[PDB]
Design a protein around this ligand. Structure first.
Ligand SMILES: *O[C@H]1[C@@H](O)[C@H](n2cnc3c(N)ncnc32)O[C@@H]1COP(=O)(O)OP(=O)(O)OP(=O)(O)OC[C@H]1O[C@@H](n2c[n+](C)c3c(=O)[nH]c(N)nc32)[C@H](O)[C@@H]1O
Ligand SMILES: [Mg+2]
Lengths: 732, 737, 95
RNA sequence: AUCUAUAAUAGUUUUU
RNA sequence: CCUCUGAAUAAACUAUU
RNA sequence: AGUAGUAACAAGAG
C-alpha cells in the first residue's frame, strides 16, 4: 500500500489543511555568489517592457533615459509600461470624488508631520548605501559621514535638527561645483575631490544585491538599497501615502495581523450584503506581473501633483522631489563575476566596473548577451534605469493607485449593470464582481483588465483565478467563509532565539502562548511544544538537569550547585533546575514563577547587582539596587542576562579604526548622561553643542544647590572656576 | 564636582574636544547609534555556533578581580583577551554558574516592589478558581482588548507626562498637568515615592509598567478585561471553554459593564417568550458574571440602565428611571418617545443612520460639576437651563444637550476628517462620535447653532456662542441660572410594579420602563458571563446563537424530522428557536413566519419533494405567530452586530451555506455539522419550497418566452407555466398550483 | 543691506546668539534681515538689563558675589525650560 | 463608549 | 614558519520590553 | 571527487 499524503485532501478541504502544503521544516534557499547577473537581467527586462518609449539624454548626468509615458496602447497581453497620464489623473479625480476631502486632510496631516519630523528619523533602518564609500554602511554611520562631509563643505542647515533642513542641505549640495571627502587605505587619511557630475551620479545611485532565504521561489532575484540623499523625500512621500491609505476601506495597508483580518472580513461581508439577491457574484484571486518594473516614477509625480493641489508651494516641492530623484536613478551592478582556469587551476575576481570595456570571450552565451544589451546604459560604474520602481519602495502609493482602479468599479462610473470592488495591498488584490449573468461577469472582468492596462497595471493571467464568492486568497491569508489558521507559517519562530538564557526562555514560552491564542495550537500540542523547547534549550545552553550524567564542560559546576542547594524547584533551568511550566502559567516569567522556592543565598547570588555579567551605573558610585543592563523579552535581569561577543572581521580591514571612534563617542555620551539624567529615558532635542549645554546645566545646578543650601560656597566657587576654564578651553 | 572635572579632562584632549564642540544635542542621538556594524543576520545559528566556543560571553574587567581564573578542577572560567571595539574581556558560562553558587549574597527584598506587576500576575493565578470544562461550538471574534490595564482615567501621553513629572521634575519641558486626574495621580505617586532610593530610570520603567495602558487586536471569546486576557490561552479554545475566575480584586466599572450587557441580552431574549416575566426571572437566576451570581450584583450594584432596572423590578427591588449619556445622568420626568432609524447626511459629506426618538419629553441632567433641565421634541431642543460651576462646566453641559437634541444644525456642524467606522471597519455609535468630535472644539457648533434675544426673566444670565455672559441675546433656547440643583432627589429609588410583559409602572400607575426602551446594541462583556441551562448559548451573541440553533436542529434531526412530518404545531413552539426569533426584525417576524409555514404546507401536499436543507434553513423562521399575506420573499434578514444579513431561500448564502461534496453545513464560517442522507429525499430536481404558491419544475425553458421578476408573478393563473428569474442569476421554469 | 549693518554694529557674541536662535526654527538670517536685527536688539537689551548687578550676602542688589538676574534668552528652548523648571522647583514661583 | 504614543530587538508577508 | 578572521536589503505588521 | 545550481565552496588575508 503506497502512502500518498496528498490523498488526505479527498476528505479534508484544502484550506482546512493548508498548513500541510508549506514545507517550512527544511532550510530555505540561499544565493551563493554574485548578484550582477540578476541586476543586469532586471535592468534589461525593465527597459524591454518600455522599449517603444522615447529615448533622451539627461543633460545633468548624461545617462540615456527611456520614457514610456503616453506611449502606444498595447495590442496584446504582454506586460507593458505605457501608462496614460490622463487616465491616471482621471482615476485620482474620481477617487477624490468618491471620498470628498481625503486629499485635503491627508495633506494637512502630512504638513504637520513634515514640519515636526526630526533628522534622527533617518537613523532608523539596517543598512544604507553610503555615497562617500561606494558600499553599504549602518544607517547611523552613513548619516554621520554625510553630515560630516556636508559640514566640511559648508552645508550646516542640518544643525537645526529638522529633517527638512537636511533636505535643504541635500538640494544645496546638488549645486556645489565640487565636493571633498576623505578616504582610508593601508589607516591613513587622503582627500578626494568629486566634480559636479560625479557627485550627482553618486547621489542618485541605489545599491543592488541578491536576496537570501526566501520561501516558495525556485530562482533568485535582486533587491535594492537606497542612498542617503533620497531617504528623507521617500519618507515624506510615504507618510502622505499612509495618511491617504488610512482613509480607504479597500486598502490592505498599513494594517496587519488580527486587525487586518477583521478589516478584510468586514469589507468582504459588506460587499456581500450590498450585492443584490438576484445577481451573480464572483471573486478573483489575482496577482500583478512585474508590478514594480512597470510602475513609472513620472506617474507617481503626476499623482502627487494632483493630490497636493491648493497647497503651499514648499509642501508641493518637498513632496515632488522624490519622484524627480527616482526617475533619474542609477543602479549599481554588484560585486562582478569570478573566472576560473582549469588547466592552471586558479580563480580570480572581475569587478563590475570593468564590464564596460571587458572582452566578451570569458563569458558564456547568456552573460555575454546581458552585457551586450546593457552596455549602452553603463555610466561611471552604474547602469541608467529611468523606468520602474526598483524593489519594495512606494508600496503605499502603489496601494493608492490600485485602490483608485478598484474605486472605478462603482455603478456611477461603469454606467452598466455590472460593477466591482475588492481589496488591494501594494500589488496583490482580490476582486469581487457582481453582474446579472455570466456575460456581465465576463464584461466586468474585461473592463477591469483593460482599465488596469491603461494605468500600466498588468494582471497575471497564469497566477490569477476566479470562482464564486465565498473563498479566496489574499496576501497569503486563505479565506474559506472566514480566514483559516495556518500554523506552518509561524513554525520557524519556534526554537531558541539566541539572545541569552533568560530572553530565550521568555521568547519560547511566549511564542507557545501566542500561537495557542492565534494559530489554533491545541493544549496537548502546546505541552509537547513546551517539552521540545525545553529540550532544545538545555542542549543549546549546556544546562541539563543537575541530577543527570550528561558530559559537558558546564556539568561540573551545575552538579556542585545542585548538590549544595536545598530547594531544587527554585533553581532555574539555566542552573540545572526542573521545568515548572504548564498551560496555566505560560504568561509568567520564570524567575517570578519560582521566586517563592529559591534559597536565600542562591536568590541573592542570582539577583546581585554587582555581577560583572551586567554593566553598572555610576550615580553616586554604583546603583546597587537591581541588576540593570534594551530589555526585550527579559522582564527581570539576572546573571543569565549576559551579552555574547561581537564579530571581529573589521579588525582585518582599513575601517578598524572606526571602532576607536565609536568607543570614543560612547565615552562622550556617557558624560552627557551625568548632566541630563533623562537623556537615556527620552531622546534630548537641542541645537547647542554638547559642551555648551553641559556647562550651562552645571552652572544652573550649582546656583540652585547653593541657593537651596545643598552645597557650600567653596564648592560653588570651584564649580564656577572650572566652568570658566572649560570656556577658555572651548576657544583653544 | 566629578562631572565637571571629567568634562574638563575630556575637553583637554583633542579628539574628545572636537566631538563635544562640533556635535549638537540633536546629533548626539545619531552618534549614539554610531557603530562599525552589528554583522548578525541569523541570531539562532550564531548562538549555536558560539556556544561551542571556549569563551563566548563578555564581562567587565572587574570579573578578573572577583572570580578565580580556574575552578576546583582547573577548568578556565575567563581569559584576558578583550572584546573588539570595547575593553570588556571574554568569559565562559562556567563563570556564570560559578557565581550563582559561590558569589557574594545580597538582599533582594525590594525586587517584588520593582516588578510588582509580574508578582501580581502570580498572585492572581495562585488564588484563582477553576470550574468545569465545557465542549461547545466556540465563535471567537476579533476585537480590541487591553493587555496592560494601566490606570483607569489616563492615556499614553498623560501617563508619560506624569512619569516625567514624578521622576524628572526639571526635564518636563513646557508641559503643565492640567487634568484633575493627572494632578491627583502625580500627587499620590509623589507621596508614595517620597524618599525613594531606587534609580530614577528604573522608577520610570516601573511607573510605565503600572500606569501606561496597552491595547491590541485579538480573537477573543468571553471577557475582554485585562485579567481575563492574560489567561486567554487557558480559558478559551477552538472547541472547549474552561471556567476560571481570577483570584484578585475585580473593578466595579467592569462589573457594571458586564451587568448591563447581561441584562440587555436577557431582556431581549425574554421579550420573544410567551411568558416574558418568568423567563426573565429564571434567566437572571441562572446567570453568573465573573463567578458571582447575578442576583447578588443586582442587589448590591447601583447601576442606572433600562435593562438593569427591568431586572431589578422583576426581582422586586427599587429602581431609578435614569440612564447615562455623555457623562450626565438623564431622568425623564415627563413625555414619551418611540425609536426610529433615520438616515442623515453629515456636515462633512457622510451618510449615516441615527436612532431618533420622537415625541415631546422633559429631562433633568445631573453631572459631577454641572446640572441642567432640558425640554425637547423630535429633533428639536425646546429649551435648556444650565447651572454649572464655571464656564467650562456650562460649556460641556451645553454641548451634551445640543448633541442629545439630535438637531440638524448639530449634524451639519460636523467638520474635518471625522469617521464613523473603526480602524477595522466596525461600526461606531454615531452619538458617541459626535460627542467626542464636539468636545474637542465646538466653535463651529456654537456659531451655527443660532442666537435669539432673551426676555431677562428672574435674573438668569445669558450665554453667547463665544461663551460669555450676555444679557440681551443668547444661544437659541439656552439659559444660565444659579439656583437649579435638585440633585438629592436624583438618588431616590422608587417602588415600582412590573407587568407580565415587562412593563414597569409607578405606584400611581404610570409606565416608566418597557422592553422597547432597551438599547438594541449588541456589545461584549468585560467579565466572563456564565449561563447554566440546557442551552448554554441562550444569551450569547448573534453568531453563536445562529450556529448553535442550526447545530441543534442538525443534531436532533431524527425526532425533529418526525415531528415536522407529523405534528408541526408543537415543533414551531420549541424553546430553542426563541433566541433565533430574537434576531429576526420584529416588524418582519410574523410575515416571515407566515411565508415559511405556507412553504412547509406545500412541501407536505406535493410528494417526492423533500429537501432536508430547505427545511433546516427555514425552520427557525416559523417560530413566530404567523401573519397571512401574499408577499414573495427571496431572502430573510437577521440582525447581526447591527447589520442586516440575508439568508437566501434558494441556494447558498453568506450566512447559511451547504456543501454537497462534503455534505456539510457552514453558518457564518462555522461548521454546524454534516447532514445525514435520507432515502425519502427527492432526487428529481424538483423544488416545492421556494415560492409561496408556485412549484419549480426545471431549468430554463425558452418555450414560454423571456423570464420575469419574482414580484411580477401575481398575474399568472392556475396551471400556467412560466420562466422566472428566481435565484442568483438563474432562470427556471415553474408552474402555479 | 540690513544684515551688513547688523553684523558690523553688534558684538560678535550677540550676533552668534541671534543667528543660532534663527537657525533653531529654520529661519535664514540672509533672507530675513529685519528679524535678524530685531533679535539682536532684543538680546542686547536683555544683556544690558541683566549685566552689572549683584546680590550681597544680606540680600540687597548692588553694582560693581552672585548675579541678580538669570538670563533665559539666548538659549535653545530645552535649556531655557530646564532653567525655568529648576527655578520654579527651588522657589515655588508660578510656572 | 473610544483607542495608530514613542525607541530597541527578533519573526512573518510582499516570482518574467 | 608565524599573526589575525569566520560576515548587518526596503515597507508594513506581529511579540516583548 | 563532493556539496551545490544560473554561482559559488572545495580556506582568505597580512
Ligand atoms: O459600554 C456601553 C454601555 O454599557 C455603557 N453604559 C451604559 N450605561 C452605563 C452606566 N449607567 N454606567 C456605566 N456605563 C454605562 O456605555 C456604553 C453605551 O454603549 P451603547 O450601547 O453603544 O450606547 P446606547 O446604545 O446605550 O446609546 P447611547 O447613545 O449611549 O444612549 C444612552 C441612553 O440615552 C438614550 N437616549 C438617547 N437619546 C437621544 C434619547 C432621546 O432622545 N430620548 C430618550 N428617551 N432617550 C434617549 C439612549 O437610547 C439610551 O437610552
Ligand atoms: Mg495575490
Amino acid at each position: 500500500m503506497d502512502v500518498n499524503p496528498t490523498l488526505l485532501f479527498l476528505k479534508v478541504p484544502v484550506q482546512n489543511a493548508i498548513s500541510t502544503t508549506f514545507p517550512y521544516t527544511g532550510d530555505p534557499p540561499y544565493s551563493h555568489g554574485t548578484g550582477t547577473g540578476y541586476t543586469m537581467d532586471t535592468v534589461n527586462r525593465t527597459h524591454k517592457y518600455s522599449e517603444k518609449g522615447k529615448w533622451t539624454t539627461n543633460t545633468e548626468t548624461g545617462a540615456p533615459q527611456l520614457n514610456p509615458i503616453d506611449g502606444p496602447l498595447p495590442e496584446d497581453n504582454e506586460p507593458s509600461g505605457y501608462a496614460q497620464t490622463d487616465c491616471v489623473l482621471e482615476a485620482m479625480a474620481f477617487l477624490e470624488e468618491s471620498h470628498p476631502g481625503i486629499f485635503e486632510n491627508s495633506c494637512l496631516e502630512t504638513m504637520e508631520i513634515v514640519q515636526q519630523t526630526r533628522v534622527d528619523k533617518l537613523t532608523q533602518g539596517r543598512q544604507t548605501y553610503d555615497w562617500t564609500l561606494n558600499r553599504n554602511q549602518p544607517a547611523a554611520t552613513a548619516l554621520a559621514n554625510t553630515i560630516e562631509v556636508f559640514r566640511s563643505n559648508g552645508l550646516t542647515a542640518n544643525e537645526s535638527g529638522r529633517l527638512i533642513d537636511f533636505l535643504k542641505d541635500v538640494m544645496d549640495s546638488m549645486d556645489k561645483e565640487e565636493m571633498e571627502i576623505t578616504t582610508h587605505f593601508q589607516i591613513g587619511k587622503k582627500k578626494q575631490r568629486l566634480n559636479k557630475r560625479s557627485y550627482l551620479i553618486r547621489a542618485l545611485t541605489l545599491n543592488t544585491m541578491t536576496k537570501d532565504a526566501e520561501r516558495g521561489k525556485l530562482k533568485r532575484r535582486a533587491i535594492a538599497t537606497p542612498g542617503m540623499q533620497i531617504r528623507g523625500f521617500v519618507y515624506f512621500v510615504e507618510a502622505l501615502a499612509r495618511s491617504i491609505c488610512e482613509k480607504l476601506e479597500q486598502s490592505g495597508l498599513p494594517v496587519g495581523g488580527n486587525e487586518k483580518k477583521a478589516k478584510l472580513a468586514n469589507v468582504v461581508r459588506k460587499m456581500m450584503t450590498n450585492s443584490q439577491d438576484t445577481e451573480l457574484s464572483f471573486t478573483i484571486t489575482g496577482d500583478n506581473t512585474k508590478w514594480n518594473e512597470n510602475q513609472n516614477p513620472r506617474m507617481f509625480l503626476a499623482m502627487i501633483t494632483y493630490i497636493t493641489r491648493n497647497q503651499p508651494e514648499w509642501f508641493r516641492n518637498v513632496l515632488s522631489i522624490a519622484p524627480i530623484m527616482f526617475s533619474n536613478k542609477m543602479a549599481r551592478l554588484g560585486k562582478g563575476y569570478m573566472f576560473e582556469s582549469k588547466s592552471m587551476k586558479l580563480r580570480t575576481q572581475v569587478p563590475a566596473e570593468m564590464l564596460a570595456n571587458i572582452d566578451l570571450k570569458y563569458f558564456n552565451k547568456s552573460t555575454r548577451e546581458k552585457i551586450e544589451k546593457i552596455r549602452p546604459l553603463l555610466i561611471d560604474g552604474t547602469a541608467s534605469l529611468s523606468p520602474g520602481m526598483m524593489m519594495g519602495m512606494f508600496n503605499m502609493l502603489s496601494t493608492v493607485l490600485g485602490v483608485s482602479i478598484l474605486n472605478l468599479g462603482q455603478k456611477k462610473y461603469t454606467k452598466t449593470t455590472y460593477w466591482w470592488d475588492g481589496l488591494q495591498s501594494s500589488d496583490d488584490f482580490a476582486l469581487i464582481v457582481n453582474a446579472p449573468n455570466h456575460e456581465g461577469i465576463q464584461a466586468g472582468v474585461d473592463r477591469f483588465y483593460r482599465t488596469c492596462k491603461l494605468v500600466g497595471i498588468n494582471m497575471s493571467k497564469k497566477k490569477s483565478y476566479i470562482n464564486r464568492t465565498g473563498t479566496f486568497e489574499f496576501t497569503s491569508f486563505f479565506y474559506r467563509y472566514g480566514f483559516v489558521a495556518n500554523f506552518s507559517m509561524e513554525l520557524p519562530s519556534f526554537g531558541v532565539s539566541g539572545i541569552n538564557e533568560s530572553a530565550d526562555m521568555s521568547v519560547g514560552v511566549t511564542v507557545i502562548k501566542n500561537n495557542m491564542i492565534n494559530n489554533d495550537l491545541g493544549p496537548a500540542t502546546a505541552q509537547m511544544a513546551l517539552q521540545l523547547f525545553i529540550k532544545d534549550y538545555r542542549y543549546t545552553y549546556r544546562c541539563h538537569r543537575g541530577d543527570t550524567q550528561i558530559q559537558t564542560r558546564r556539568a561540573f559546576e551545575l552538579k556542585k550547585l545542585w548538590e549544595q542547594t536545598r530547594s531544587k524547584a527554585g533553581l532555574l533551568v539555566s542552573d540545572g533546575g526542573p521545568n515548572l511550566y504548564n498551560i496555566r502559567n505560560l504568561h509568567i516569567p520564570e524567575v517570578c514563577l519560582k521566586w517563592e522556592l529559591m534559597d536565600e543565598d542562591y536568590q541573592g547570588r542570582l539577583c546581585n547587582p554587582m555581577n560583572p555579567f551586567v554593566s553598572h551605573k555610576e550615580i553616586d558610585s554604583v546603583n546597587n539596587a537591581v541588576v540593570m543592563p534594551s530589555m526585550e523579552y527579559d522582564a527581570v535581569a539576572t546573571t543569565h542576562s549576559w551579552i555574547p561577543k561581537r564579530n571581529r572581521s573589521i579588525l582585518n580591514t582599513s575601517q578598524r579604526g572606526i571602532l576607536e571612534d565609536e568607543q570614543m563617542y560612547q565615552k562622550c555620551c556617557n558624560l552627557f548622561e551625568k548632566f541630563f539624567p533623562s537623556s537615556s529615558y527620552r531622546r534630548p532635542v537641542g541645537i547647542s553643542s554638547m559642551v555648551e549645554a553641559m556647562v550651562s546645566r552645571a552652572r544652573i545646578d550649582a546656583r540652585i544647590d547653593f541657593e537651596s543650601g545643598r552645597i557650600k560656597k567653596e564648592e560653588f566657587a570651584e564649580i564656577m572656576k572650572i566652568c570658566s576654564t572649560i570656556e577658555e578651553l572651548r576657544r583653544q | 564636582m566629578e562631572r565637571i572635572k571629567e568634562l574638563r579632562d575630556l575637553m583637554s584632549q583633542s579628539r574628545t574636544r572636537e566631538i563635544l564642540t562640533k556635535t549638537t544635542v540633536d546629533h548626539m542621538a545619531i552618534i549614539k547609534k554610531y557603530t562599525s556594524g552589528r554583522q548578525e543576520k541569523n541570531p539562532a545559528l550564531r548562538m549555536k555556533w558560539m556556544m561551542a566556543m571556549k569563551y563566548p560571553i563578555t564581562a567587565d574587567k572587574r570579573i578578573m578581580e572577583m572570580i578565580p581564573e580556574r575552578n576546583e578542577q582547573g577548568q578556565t572560567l575567563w581569559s584576558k583577551t578583550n572584546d573588539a571595539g570595547s575593553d570588556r574581556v571574554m568569559v565562559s558560562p562556567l563563570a556564570v554558574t560559578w557565581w550563582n553558587r559561590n558569589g557574594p549574597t545580597t538582599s533582594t527584598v525590594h525586587y517584588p516592589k520593582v516588578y510588582k506587576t509580574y508578582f501580581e500576575k502570580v498572585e492572581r493565578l495562585k488564588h484563582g478558581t477553576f470550574g468545569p470544562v465545557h465542549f461547545r461550538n466556540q465563535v471567537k471574534i476579533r476585537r480590541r482588548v487591553d493587555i496592560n490595564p494601566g490606570h483607569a482615567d489616563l492615556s499614553a501621553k498623560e501617563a508619560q507626562d506624569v512619569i516625567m513629572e514624578v521622576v524628572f521634575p526639571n526635564e518636563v519641558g513646557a508641559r503643565i498637568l492640567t487634568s484633575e486626574s493627572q494632578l491627583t495621580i502625580t500627587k499620590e505617586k509623589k507621596k508614595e515615592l517620597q524618599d525613594c532610593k531606587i534609580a530614577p530610570l528604573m522608577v520610570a520603567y516601573m511607573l510605565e509598567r503600572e500606569l501606561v495602558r496597552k491595547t491590541r487586536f485579538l480573537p477573543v471569546a468571553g471577557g475582554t478585561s485585562s485579567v481575563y486576557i492574560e489567561v486567554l490561552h487557558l480559558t478559551q479554545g477552538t472547541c472547549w471553554e474552561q471556567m476560571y475566575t481570577p483570584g484578585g480584586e475585580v473593578r466595579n466599572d467592569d462589573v457594571d459593564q458586564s451587568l448591563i450587557i447581561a441584562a440587555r441580552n436577557i431582556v431581549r431574549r425574554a421579550t420573544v417568550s410567551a411568558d416574558p416575566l418568568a423567563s426573565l426571572l429564571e434567566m437572571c437566576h441562572s446567570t453568573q458574571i465573573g463567578g458571582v451570581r447575578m442576583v447578588d450584583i443586582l442587589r448590591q450594584n447601583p447601576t442606572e440602565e433600562q435593562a438593569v432596572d427591568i431586572c431589578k423590578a422583576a426581582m422586586g427591588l427599587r429602581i431609578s428611571s435614569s440612564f447615562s449619556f455623555g457623562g450626565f445622568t438623564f431622568k425623564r420626568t415627563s413625555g414619551s418617545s418611540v425609536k426610529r432609524e433615520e438616515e442623515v447626511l453629515t456636515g462633512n459629506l457622510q451618510t449615516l443612520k441615527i436612532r431618533v426618538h420622537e415625541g415631546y419629553e422633559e429631562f433633568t441632567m445631573v453631572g459631577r460639576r454641572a446640572t441642567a433641565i432640558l425640554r425637547k421634541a423630535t429633533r428639536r431642543l425646546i429649551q435648556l437651563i444650565v447651572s454649572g460651576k464655571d464656564e467650562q462646566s456650562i460649556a460641556e453641559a451645553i454641548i451634551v444637550a445640543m448633541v442629545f437634541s439630535q438637531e440638524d444644525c448639530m449634524i451639519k456642524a460636523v467638520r474635518g476628517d471625522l469617521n464613523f467606522v473603526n480602524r477595522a471597519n466596525q461600526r461606531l455609535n454615531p452619538m458617541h462620535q459626535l460627542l467626542r468630535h464636539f468636545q474637542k472644539d465646538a466653535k463651529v457648533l456654537f456659531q451655527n447653532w443660532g442666537i435669539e434675544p432673551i426676555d431677562n426673566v428672574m435674573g438668569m444670565i445669558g450665554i453667547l456662542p463665544d461663551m460669555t455672559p450676555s444679557t440681551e441675546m443668547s444661544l437659541r433656547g439656552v439659559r444660565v441660572s444659579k439656583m437649579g440643583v435638585d440633585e438629592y432627589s436624583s438618588t431616590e429609588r422608587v417602588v415600582v410594579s412590573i407587568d407580565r410583559f415587562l412593563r414597569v409602572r409607578d405606584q400611581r400607575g404610570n409606565v416608566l420602563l418597557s422592553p422597547e426602551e432597551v438599547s438594541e446594541t449588541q456589545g461584549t462583556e468585560k467579565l466572563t458571563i456564565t449561563y447554566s441551562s440546557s442551552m448554554m448559548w441562550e444569551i450569547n451573541g448573534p453568531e453563536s446563537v445562529l450556529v448553535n440553533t442550526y447545530q441543534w436542529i442538525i443534531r436532533n434531526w431524527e425526532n425533529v424530522k418526525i415531528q415536522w412530518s407529523q405534528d408541526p404545531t408543537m415543533l414551531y413552539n420549541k424553546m430553542e428557536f426563541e433566541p433565533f426569533q430574537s434576531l429576526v426584525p420584529k416588524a418582519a417576524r410574523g410575515q416571515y413566519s407566515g411565508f415559511v409555514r405556507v412553504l412547509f404546507q406545500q412541501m407536505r401536499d406535493v410528494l417526492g419533494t423533500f429537501d432536508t436543507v430547505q427545511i433546516i434553513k427555514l425552520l427557525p423562521f416559523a417560530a413566530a405567530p404567523p401573519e397571512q399575506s401574499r408577499m414573495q420573499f427571496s431572502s430573510l434578514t437577521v440582525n447581526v452586530r447591527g447589520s442586516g444579513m440575508r439568508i437566501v431561500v434558494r441556494g447558498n448564502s453568506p450566512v447559511f451555506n451547504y456543501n454537497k461534496a462534503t455534505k456539510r453545513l457552514t453558518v457564518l464560517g462555522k461548521d454546524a455539522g454534516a447532514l445525514m442522507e435520507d432515502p425519502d429525499e427527492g432526487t428529481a430536481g424538483v423544488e416545492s419550497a421556494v415560492l409561496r404558491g408556485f412549484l419549480i419544475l426545471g431549468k430554463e425553458n425558452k418555450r414560454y418566452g423571456p423570464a420575469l421578476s419574482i414580484n411580477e408573478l401575481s398575474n399568472l393563473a392556475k396551471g400556467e407555466k412560466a420562466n422566472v428569474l428566481i435565484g442568483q442569476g438563474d432562470v427556471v421554469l415553474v408552474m402555479k398550483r | 543691506g540690513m544684515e551688513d549693518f547688523v553684523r558690523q554694529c553688534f558684538n560678535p557674541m550677540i550676533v552668534e546668539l541671534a543667528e543660532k536662535a534663527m537657525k533653531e526654527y529654520g529661519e535664514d538670517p540672509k533672507i530675513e534681515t529685519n528679524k535678524f536685527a530685531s533679535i539682536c536688539t532684543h538680546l542686547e537689551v536683555c544683556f544690558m538689563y541683566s549685566d552689572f548687578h549683584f546680590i550681597d550676602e544680606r540680600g540687597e542688589s548692588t553694582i560693581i558675589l552672585k548675579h541678580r538676574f538669570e538670563i533665559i534668552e539666548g538659549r535653545d528652548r530645552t535649556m531655557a525650560w530646564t532653567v525655568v523648571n529648576s527655578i520654579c522647583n527651588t522657589t515655588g514661583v508660578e510656572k
